[PDB]
Amino acid sequence: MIKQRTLKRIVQATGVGLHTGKKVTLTLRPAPANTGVIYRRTDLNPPVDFPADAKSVRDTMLCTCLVNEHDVRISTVEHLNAALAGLGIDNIVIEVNAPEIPIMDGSAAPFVYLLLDAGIDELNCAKKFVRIKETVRVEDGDKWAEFKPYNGFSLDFTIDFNHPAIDSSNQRYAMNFSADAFMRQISRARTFGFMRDIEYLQSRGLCLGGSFDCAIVVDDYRVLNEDGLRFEDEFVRHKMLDAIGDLFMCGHNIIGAFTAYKSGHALNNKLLQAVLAKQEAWEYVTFQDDAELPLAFKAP
Template sequence: MKGFIGARQTTLASEVSLTGTGVHSGAPVSISLCPADDNTGIRFLLSNGHGDTEIPADQRSVTGVNLCTVLGDGNGASVATVEHLLAALHGLGVDNAQIEIDSCEVPIMDGSAAGFVEAIDDVGLAELEAPRRFLKVLKPISVEDGGAHGELVPNNGFHLDVEIEFDTPLIGTQRIEIDVNPGSFRRELARARTFGFMKDVERLWAAGLALGASLDNTVAIGDDRVVNREGLRYSDEFVRHKALDAVGDLALAGAPILGAFRSRRGGHRLNMLVLKALFADADAWTMIEAPRYREVRHAELSHRLAAANFAAERS
């Protein structure tokens, strides 16, 4: 199984806390990323002043995909803009964590996953006893949504092929293909920021959205230039951010995917349509477990060395 390090599940080695602002609400947010037992998965624990509400990071919890991905409990509690944090956890190979949050929106940080990656790297990962579980794609699943196309096909690792097309020479058509693992995620995707068009800002504000958006957390696109003084972090930062979003959205499968995801002119809605189409077809996927160390024998040493270096692999 290429692309994933370690045969056993992981969690955070210790708790780490962050503060920031909700990009849509504009409200201050505090979150804590906490260790969790094996087979817990990723779970959000919302503090609302009247007790705590737990929402699993699972495709069945998705209640919104307009501008960001929103998870809800079915009774009115929700947490929005989860995709960048989930991308960081999934991209670095964190299987289990509890995310304690005091707001209804994950902080936007600098518009990328870099702040979350740094926090996770600061505490490192701990290996658990249970074998890592994978979602293996068994046959192609394809979705058309207007002018967008998405699919998942069988593959021995997690591969992304994302293409975007915007009617502006500042973006145009961009495409990225990448085998996602902790190293490639850090180098190629983690720092890619969210972006938006200046002409859309007033419309979003009128709708009560993007109240926390600024040049500190969004790549702003004007009529003929990128407004941010520092420019772009990658020449194709726009498509890299769409790939980052895809990593976060597909993390809602609940386990690392063994499959290749292809997206054309997509976004959160398409990502979720593909994932839901996969789960709707029981013949299209299966869950498998990595072999336990005692079963791999001669490979045991290399697995242990890989796991020991997991948290230290940075770029």
Template structure:
């Protein structure tokens, strides 16, 4: 049902689509509806079902992130929506620019721990072009952030699109040191990244439970590692599923720049916090990037600072 479309035009969904499940951290049920949205609106989450009856639209951009500890959480006042990264990765990986997302629950459902369920929902709804040019962020100069041995950077790319180079290093088997490189396309996202699941160590579970997190994590939505192996009966989907999932997280986190990035991303031992810091550093360094497409719009408006939605 996905339409053929020029990549220079913005896109949205062809119809509304709904999903439901349990949040990986809260353990609470959640239902979300993804609906078509107008050109220029971006990805906007609205939290429903609050005790005070208020609805709080939140644009999925870095300035609205209230926490990047273990997951990305959008927040404004008393309203928050957690664990948006896998859904954001699916939207960016399939080149969907504008979506209105109603969330009845505190967290995006974990599904199977990957972006596959979100890809299926997007495919069911279809993707259509809008009569407006797509705005992208072209990297003009390198930006880099670091935290000890971990680091992440964006640099100009020799060819168009987003080039990703992600490396992880864990002492524990079966992860070890893994590295994967790719130029992002919808086809490669579907085949190589979308099905990679989140992972965690059994030894960390009790601490997370005491902190009120990972309450919905299970073998159905997490690769659980203990004694040097994955405990999941079905095993791994890819030999390097761990670094593929980190690449999935990177894509969802970079989407918080508010527009597709044209450039080369590279990281070593990165995570949500470092990825967010990189996006924030990029947007705070005007000399490091330029917008391509929608050049006629004022810069403040192109940055997403105008309008009623936060």
């Protein structure tokens, strides 16, 4: 039987928050079966829990955040969340002594190593997948994203970049998901932003943790980062990192074909909720026989 997984040990890392510019201590914890992914703030007293849920997502100007009953928020969860999907973590408690998850280097890669340190612990309970049964499409103007039936997990991302530092050769990335593919092709792709916008926010006391160390930054004409890009198509690669993170907000690996045109947090999540809302459009599945497991979701 393909089992749910959690961490073997508690681990912790430190980093700067994109918003506050302050040191944030991150602590990952093992958790029992079926409890799923939980983000927790410990700066507040008492601590607040934010169960990872498609409904609780809000796409803020900077990255994304989760919201509770009272509109208290925990921010910048999506990159770490993507790494959770990547390494196949089902149950876990994620604590920060601050309003946000550290931004680190702008990618998911630093989280990969952190999770590796924590190790994997298989729990004696079946792991549930969300198998796409019907085609489901959502749009926003000329933008669209859809899930289609397919025995595996694939993503086909196209984003409209009109920037001089992003070539037409590098607007599209497509992959068949797998822990290995995620760690090597996707995890190191950093987030990006426009330099004047960031200057402005920082002049207004926002985005204070922003630096070359946490994001690709471009002016009107070129990438400003001394060392350039980790990939020629690092931008679209990070957008797929973000898509994986968005989709995993439901706490389950999805079996199907993801396709998106100019999609983003808002639209990815809109698809996710649309799919989950239509009862006939999907179903839970478990694998007693380990060999039935689709290629995409085998251990790393």
